[PDB]
Design an enzyme around this catalytic site. Structure first.
Site, PDB file in Angstrom:
ATOM      1  N   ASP A 180       0.855  -1.221   0.000  1.00 51.53           N
ATOM      2  CA  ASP A 180       0.000   0.000   0.000  1.00 51.53           C
ATOM      3  C   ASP A 180       0.877   1.252   0.000  1.00 51.53           C
ATOM      4  OD1 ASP A 180      -2.393  -1.504   0.038  1.00 51.53           O
ATOM      5  OD2 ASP A 180      -3.267  -0.228   1.542  1.00 51.53           O
ATOM      6  N   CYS A 214      -1.804   0.637 -13.444  1.00 56.44           N
ATOM      7  CA  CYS A 214      -1.890   0.653 -11.970  1.00 56.44           C
ATOM      8  C   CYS A 214      -3.124   1.533 -11.748  1.00 56.44           C
ATOM      9  CB  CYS A 214      -0.535   1.040 -11.404  1.00 56.44           C
ATOM     10  SG  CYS A 214       0.156   2.556 -12.117  1.00 56.44           S
ATOM     11  N   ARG A 220       3.805   2.646 -10.729  1.00 56.89           N
ATOM     12  CA  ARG A 220       4.173   1.213 -10.857  1.00 56.89           C
ATOM     13  C   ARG A 220       4.291   0.827 -12.332  1.00 56.89           C
ATOM     14  NH1 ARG A 220      -0.233  -0.907  -6.389  1.00 56.89           N
ATOM     15  NH2 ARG A 220       0.311   0.652  -4.807  1.00 56.89           N
ATOM     16  N   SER A 221       3.351   1.264 -13.149  1.00 58.46           N
ATOM     17  CA  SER A 221       3.312   0.986 -14.613  1.00 58.46           C
ATOM     18  C   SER A 221       4.623   1.421 -15.255  1.00 58.46           C
ATOM     19  CB  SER A 221       2.151   1.692 -15.268  1.00 58.46           C
ATOM     20  OG  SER A 221       0.913   1.166 -14.816  1.00 58.46           O
ATOM     21  N   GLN A 261       6.814   7.969 -10.057  1.00 57.51           N
ATOM     22  CA  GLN A 261       6.103   9.025  -9.285  1.00 57.51           C
ATOM     23  C   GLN A 261       6.967   9.517  -8.118  1.00 57.51           C
ATOM     24  OE1 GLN A 261       1.972   7.125  -9.134  1.00 57.51           O
ATOM     25  NE2 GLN A 261       1.469   9.283  -8.874  1.00 57.51           N
TER      26      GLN A 261
END
Ligand code: JGD
Length: 281
Positions: A180, A214, A220-221, A261
């Site tokens: 998370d 994602c 994440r992508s 990110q």
């Protein structure tokens, strides 16, 4: 070499600083179609938009807009569609895009619920005998089989075009253990997952581009595509240590904003590529 650069940045704790230079160097192109008022309900986040030049168009005359980008890596001969996790109202659009682009694989790097909020609509069937029909786009989706492992699930899906009665097999690769908060401690299970997608044929030029998502389709992508492209360039080049992960990331950012990110995601990308290089040498 990036193993040496990794230790330099890590021992000097400069990850926030490297990450900021990438942010400042990154391309900015128009995203006018994404900001049209009629497209307002097709975007999960108002600050995450596809560039007009690389956006995927739906072949429906009404509204061709989906929050999705084609990332073309010319030297690596790899393409990827990066998209947001579908919304309740865009699940039909998502599968229309899969159909129209002739994709063989969908890579999902999030859970439907994270931090107590929905990050994605449930866009695939949970049981063999309860298929999903998308009336807006005239597609039927059936779960054929599901293989649940510790770190990821692979599902075989049948997508049927109800208009023409053609069917295709789609593979759904679901990485289920990204925490998370933060990044995985070790890149081992992520690399295993990446090699499983490669082994499937989903990343091969015979097929349309893989769809990777994602929640926003940037974090994440981004890590997924960056690791795959960097490892492929190391196979292809006379000198594997000529591969600069910062240059590759900047090339990918020409096609979709904001890929990677956080400074943590940048560090994890280095670690995944450094570790992956061992299995590739
Ligand atoms: C724009 N947005 C995040 C939504 C649209 C429809 N349902 C839920 C959310």
């Amino acid at each position: 070499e990036m193993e040496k650069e990794f230790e330099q940045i890590d021992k000097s704790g400069s990850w926030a600083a490297i990450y900021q230079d990438i942010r400042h160097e990154a391309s900015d192109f128009p995203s006018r179609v994404a900001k049209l008022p009629k497209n307002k309900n097709r975007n999960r986040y108002r600050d995450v938009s596809p560039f007009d030049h690389s956006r995927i168009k739906l072949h429906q005359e009404d509204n061709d807009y989906i929050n999705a980008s084609l990332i073309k890596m010319e030297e690596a001969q790899r393409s990827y569609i990066l998209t947001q996790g579908p919304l309740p109202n865009t699940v039909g659009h998502f599968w229309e895009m899969v159909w129209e682009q002739k994709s063989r694989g969908v890579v999902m790097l999030n859970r439907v619920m994270e931090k107590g909020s929905l990050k994605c609509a449930q866009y695939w069937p949970q049981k063999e005998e309860k298929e999903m029909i998308f009336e807006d786009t005239n597609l039927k989706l059936t779960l054929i089989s599901e293989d649940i492992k510790s770190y990821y699930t692979v599902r075989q899906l049948e997508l049927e075009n109800l208009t023409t009665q053609e069917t295709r097999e789609i593979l759904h690769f679901h990485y289920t253990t990204w925490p998370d908060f933060g990044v995985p401690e070790s890149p081992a299970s992520f690399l295993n997952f990446l090699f499983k997608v490669r082994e499937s044929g989903s990343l091969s030029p015979e097929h349309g581009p893989v769809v990777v998502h994602c929640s926003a389709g940037i974090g994440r992508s981004g890590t997924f595509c960056l690791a795959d492209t960097c490892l492929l360039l190391m196979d292809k080049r006379k000198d594997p240590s000529s591969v600069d992960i910062k240059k590759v990331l900047l090339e990918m950012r020409k096609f979709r904003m904001g890929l990677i990110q956080t400074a943590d995601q940048l560090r994890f990308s280095y670690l995944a590529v450094i570790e992956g290089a061992k299995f590739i040498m």
